From a paper:
The essential and metabolic enzyme adenylate kinase (AK) undergoes large-scale conformational changes in response to binding of its substrates ATP and AMP.
The structure of the AKeco Glu114Ala variant in complex with the inhibitor Ap5A was determined to 1.6 Å resolution with X-ray crystallography. The observed salt bridge between Glu114 and Arg165 present in the open state of the AKeco structure is disrupted in the Glu114Ala variant, and there are no significant structural effects on the overall structure due to the Glu to Ala substitution in the closed state. However, a close-up view of the N-terminus of the E114-helix in the closed state revealed two bound water molecules that seem to compensate for the missing carboxyl group of the Ala114 side chain. Two water molecules in the Glu114Ala variant, shown here in turquoise, occupy the position of the oxygen atoms in the native Glu114 carboxyl group. Taken together, the data agree with the Glu114-Arg165 salt bridge being important for the inherent local structural stabilization of the open conformation of the ATPlid in AKeco.
Numbering used by the authors: 1 to 214
The structure:
C-alpha cells in the first residue's frame, strides 16, 4: 500500500499518519521530520535545510528528492509506505513518476487558511519519533510529555506565526497545484483520490479515512 497525504500546513496530515501506519504496517516517509533530523545530527544530506526552514521557504526539489530516494530504497519500504509532506511541488511529483513510484491513494486534507496559525501555535512535538500533539485540540496524556517515552515535548523552531504565514504562501504558490495534478491522475485511472474535511475532530477525520481506505 502506497499513500500520499496532501494538504496545507497544519491540516492534520502527520496526526493521521500514525493511524494509517498501524493499519497497513507501513512506515511514514515524512520529509519535514527527516530534514529536521538531518539538521539536528549534522548529516551531510539535509543539514542544508536549516536556514531555509527557518525562513518558511521550501527546500530545493533536488535535495528532498535524494532524501526520499535513499529512504524508500530500504527494506522496510518494500511492501509500501506513506508519503507525508512529499511530493510538495510538481517537479517532485514528476520525479516520482519518472522513477516509477506509483501510489494507490492520494488523500487531500482540507482546512481553511484562517485556522492554520491557531493549529501551529499549539503544536508540540516529540522529535525522536515524529509524534505530534496540540496543547488544546489533541493534548498529551501528561502535560508536556510524550505519551510513549515520557520525554519533554518541544516546540518546532519554525512554528512561529510569521513563519507559518510564509509557509502558507509557499503552499498556495507551489504545492496546492498538486491537488489538480493528482486529481487528473485519478481521472486517468492511475490512482485513487479522496478529499476529507480536516476541520472535524481528530477521531472523526480518522473514521472518515477508514471509510475511504476500507
Ligand atoms: N517535500 C518538501 N520539499 C521542500 N521542502 C520541504 C519538504 N518537506 C518539508 N520541507 C521543509 O520543511 C518545512 C516544514 O515542513 P513540514 O514539516 O511539512 O511543516 P508544515 O508545513 O508546518 O505542515 P505539517 O505537514 O507538519 O502539518 P500537518 O498537516 O502534518 O498537521 P499536524 O498533524 O502537525 O497538525 C497540526 C496541529 O493541529 C493539531 N491537529 C491535528 N489534527 C487536528 C484536528 N483534526 N483538529 C484539530 N486540531 C488538529 C495537531 O495536534 C497539531 O498540533 C517546510 O517549510 C520546508 O522548508
Amino acid at each position: 500500500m502506497r499513500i500520499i497525504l496532501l494538504g496545507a500546513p497544519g491540516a492534520g496530515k502527520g496526526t493521521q499518519a500514525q493511524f494509517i501506519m498501524e493499519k497497513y504496517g507501513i512506515p511514514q516517509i515524512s520529509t519535514g521530520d527527516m530534514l529536521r533530523a538531518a539538521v539536528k545530527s549534522g548529516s551531510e544530506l539535509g543539514k542544508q535545510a536549516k536556514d531555509i526552514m527557518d525562513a518558511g521557504k521550501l527546500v530545493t526539489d533536488e535535495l528532498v528528492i535524494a532524501l526520499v530516494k535513499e529512504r524508500i530504497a530500504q527494506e522496510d519500504c518494500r511492501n509500501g509506505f506513506l508519503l507525508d509532506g512529499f511530493p510538495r511541488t510538481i517537479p517532485q511529483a514528476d520525479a516520482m513518476k519518472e522513477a516509477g513510484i506509483n501510489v494507490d491513494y492520494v488523500l487531500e486534507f482540507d482546512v481553511p487558511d484562517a485556522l492554520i496559525v491557531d493549529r501551529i501555535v499549539g503544536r508540540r512535538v516529540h522529535a525522536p519519533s515524529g509524534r505530534v500533539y496540540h496543547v488544546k485540540f489533541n493534548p498529551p496524556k501528561v502535560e508536556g510529555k510524550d505519551d510513549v517515552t515520557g520525554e519533554e515535548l518541544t516546540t518546532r523552531k519554525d512554528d512561529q506565526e510569521e513563519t507559518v504565514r510564509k509557509r502558507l504562501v509557499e503552499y498556495h504558490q507551489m504545492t496546492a497545484p498538486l491537488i489538480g495534478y493528482y486529481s487528473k491522475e485519478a481521472e486517468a485511472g492511475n490512482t485513487k483520490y479522496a478529499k476529507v474535511d480536516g476541520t472535524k475532530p481528530v477521531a472523526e477525520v480518522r473514521a472518515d479515512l477508514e471509510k475511504i481506505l476500507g
